[PDB]
Design a protein around this ligand. Structure first.
Ligand SMILES: Cc1c(C(=O)NCCN[C@H]2[C@@H]3C[C@H]4C[C@@H](C3)C[C@@H]2C4)nn(-c2ccc(F)cc2F)c1-c1ccc(Cl)cc1
Length: 734
């Protein structure tokens, strides 16, 4: 119930044996880090679709019975070097034999190149389109070998360098696997750059906060240990479910913000409570009780605000949820245990060994004083600004992944766009119409015919032959499928890629000719199904978030109208950050400065942004109001309580904001637009929340609601808040 005896026992226990704990924890965390140093080679770059949807099963049926298509795994554009034509029998033979021998070398992971160069004297109609009219450019296609996406990607990774050098390295590779490889390489480069350009800045700001080196060095060590432990735990959980590759940067971000932050707070409180001549044991006990309590409560708040992501079916969000939970929980545990143990074994030597306040507190006090003299004069402008900064939410369109997630001067994107400009029409996204047999094991003919007749009523579908006789054409059947007489797929493509959903639902509503059943599982179908599922299950997640955070905040300090204020402030900062992000990434303003390209936002990212911004925003309020009510408890009036709370929380919240902002800024400079999106989200939320919200709105709304801030009704207040955790004002003894 009370849990305070538990924290006191934990304190005296940690000091009772403060070598076993540090030993076992450092050993376990280093072992986990060494074991997780191979988290790669096990992260699947897959999962963006509702795995229970209809279109996913459609595509599965299709590529199982017909065999997955490999004509677009890798394409290669070739040009004759000596400014000649493409026929050029000599150069033709040279390139041909080179490709033949390089296929002979790695024959296991290359099914075999095909293209116009193979028998160039052919008269085939479509094969005669792999050459440019001026006979200057040609291209080929190389189908890789594999049974799943990761196998094919690894095969491409191992065959890349041997293929990049052909007829003088003028070959230009494009397709799908180059894009995937470039994205993963971008994630790796992000890790490297963020580490190397965020360790020194964090070290500098830390040393500037404290004034010594050892105290400024402990949080860096615990942050490294937290990163190692989180990587270990993720590698361990990988064997039970696929872990999306987007969980390596999240861990490095949340293990340099949160862990460093917690360590800073704990060491600060210890250095403060040791200034009273206390013995190291009592100092450790007091720090453990108070600061460990607030840190554990912050960790529980973050976990219970990042759990609701488990409602969505996208396999991309569950990995992020597991990463956040694991890293936050391990950071809290490492913080309390190892910090207490290291402080115990160190004691008073945490001030020397590194040699060679009034103005700040006075500033914050003068600030809160001059802003409390009139509430409305500081509550009207900020509120109208943050309610008129939410209007960009009207232009909110979403989409999928393309090659426009890279800087427009990248190598691979330019090659892909060049290939799409030279050779048009060879990049299509059809809408399959797979039909499965209910009755009639062989799907007799003219059934496909009446189904085509049925489907030809929908408009908006392309027709290159300009004739309905060649519309909704069957797809090619590779020699890797079963080719059953029961399933036979037809397909065709549309013209306006944006209005897909309308035609998709119309097709879904069409009545099949007989007991056989229809499906529409194309790629725009996949994307539209993902969008529809996310927007269908978002409101329940929002309500669960609100209820969880409000209820969990009530139990920390009995008051009904404080959770309301916290929820309002969180909703306003969330809406404001969302509006700024939309105006920045969809309206396009500020693009040429940050080197990206305007485009619709990512599909399963509006969930992550919400479930993170709400978390941190309700985390700061939980801390501030906690200090405030601790001050209020004994005999101090409202305004004095607000003043002392803000004065105390000032420097620590500033240091926290600086650490988190420095790490987020070190991540801003990424290439993959999703990283930039998340980083700008975090930075905007952090600054706009902390500075403006806190020190120009919280005192104002508190005073306007003055002295009616604990109205909480007697019955529930007593029976629940008292029978449990409690108020436990810390008693000071001799
Ligand atoms: C969540 C969260 C919090 C948070 O909620 N942090 C609370 C700040 N610590 C508070 C406690 C300890 C002390 C005292 C109280 C309680 C007040 C402060 C200071 N930060 N990040 C964060 C991490 C790295 C950055 F580069 C920037 C950040 F924003 C996250 C976060 C963001 C994205 C993702 Cl994918 C995962 C995590």
């Amino acid at each position: 119930f009370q849990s305070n005896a538990m924290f006191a026992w934990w304190g005296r226990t940690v000091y009772q044996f403060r070598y076993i704990v540090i030993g076992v924890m450092v050993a376990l965390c280093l072992g986990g880090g060494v074991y997780g140093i191979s988290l790669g080679n096990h992260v699947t770059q897959s999962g963006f679709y509702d795995e229970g949807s209809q279109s996913v099963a459609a595509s599965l049926i299709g590529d199982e019975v017909y065999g997955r298509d490999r004509t677009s795994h890798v394409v290669a554009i070739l040009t004759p070097p000596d400014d000649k034509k493409v026929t050029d029998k000599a150069w033709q033979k040279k390139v041909t034999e080179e490709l033949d021998q390089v296929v002979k070398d790695h024959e296991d992971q290359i099914v075999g190149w095909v293209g116009w160069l193979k028998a160039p004297d052919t008269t085939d109609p479509t094969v005669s389109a792999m050459k440019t009219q001026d006979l200057r450019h040609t291209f080929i296609s190389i189908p890789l070998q594999g049974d799943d996406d990761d196998e094919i990607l690894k095969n491409y990774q191992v065959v890349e360098p041997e293929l990049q050098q052909v007829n003088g390295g003028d070959i230009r590779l494009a397709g799908l696997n180059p894009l995937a490889s470039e994205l993963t390489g971008t994630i790796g480069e992000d890790q490297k750059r963020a580490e190397v350009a965020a360790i020194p800045l964090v070290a500098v700001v830390l040393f500037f906060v404290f004034g010594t080196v050892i105290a400024a060095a402990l949080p860096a060590i615990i942050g490294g240990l937290a990163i190692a432990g989180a990587l270990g735990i993720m590698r361990l959980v990988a064997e039970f479910t696929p872990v999306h590759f987007f969980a390596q940067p999240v861990v490095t971000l949340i293990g340099l913000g949160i862990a460093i932050d917690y360590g800073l707070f704990i060491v600060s409180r210890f250095r403060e409570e040791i200034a009273e001549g206390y013995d190291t044991e009592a100092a450790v006990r007091r720090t453990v009780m108070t600061s460990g309590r607030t840190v554990v409560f912050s960790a529980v708040i973050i976990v219970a605000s990042s759990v609701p992501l488990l409602l969505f079916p996208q396999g991309f969000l569950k990995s992020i949820t597991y990463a956040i939970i694991a890293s936050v929980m391990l950071a809290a545990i490492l913080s309390i245990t190892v910090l207490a143990a290291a402080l115990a074994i160190l004691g008073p030597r945490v001030d020397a060994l590194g040699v060679t306040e009034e103005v700040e507190r006075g500033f914050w006090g003068r600030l809160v004083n001059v802003v409390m003299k009139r509430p409305i004069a500081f509550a009207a402008p900020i509120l109208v600004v943050m309610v008129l900064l939410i209007i960009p939410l009207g232009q909110l369109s979403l989409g999928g992944i393309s090659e426009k997630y890279l800087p427009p001067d990248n190598a691979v994107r330019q090659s892909q766009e060049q290939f799409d400009k030279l050779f048009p029409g060879f990049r299509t996204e059809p809408l399959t119409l797979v039909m499965k047999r209910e009755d009639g094991e062989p799907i007799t003919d003219a059934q496909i015919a009446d189904m085509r007749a049925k489907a030809l009523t929908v408009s908006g579908f392309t027709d290159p032959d300009n004739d309905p006789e060649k519309m909704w054409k069957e797809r090619p059947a590779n020699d890797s499928g079963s080719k059953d007489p029961s399933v036979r797929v037809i397909q065709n493509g549309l013209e306006n890629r944006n209005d897909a959903a309308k035609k998709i639902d119309e097709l879904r509503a069409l009545q099949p000719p007989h007991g056989i059943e229809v499906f529409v599982g194309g790629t725009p179908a996949l994307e539209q199904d993902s969008i529809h599922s996310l927007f269908d299950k978002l409101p329940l997640m929002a309500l669960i978030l609100i209820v969880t955070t409000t209820v969990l905040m009530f139990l920390a300090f009995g008051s009904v109208v404080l959770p309301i204020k916290a929820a309002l402030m969180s909703a306003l900062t969330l809406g404001s950050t969302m509006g700024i992000l939309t105006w920045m990434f969809v309206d396009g303003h500020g693009s040429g400065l940050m080197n990206y390209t305007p485009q619709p936002l990512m599909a399963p990212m509006i969930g992550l942004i919400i479930a993170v911004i709400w978390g941190l925003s309700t985390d700061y309020e939980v801390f501030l109001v906690s200090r405030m009510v601790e001050a209020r408890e004994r005999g101090m009036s409202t305004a004095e309580a607000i003043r002392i709370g803000t004065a105390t929380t000032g420097r620590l919240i500033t240091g926290a904001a600086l650490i988190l902002a420095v790490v987020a800024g070190a991540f801003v400079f990424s290439d993959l637009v999703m990283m930039k999106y998340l980083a700008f989200g975090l930075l905007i939320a952090l600054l706009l929340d902390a500075t403006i919200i806190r020190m120009f709105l919280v005192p104002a709304v508190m005073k306007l609601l003055g002295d009616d801030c604990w109205w909480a009704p007697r019955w529930m207040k007593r029976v629940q808040e008292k029978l449990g955790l409690g108020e436990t004002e810390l008693p000071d003894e001799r």
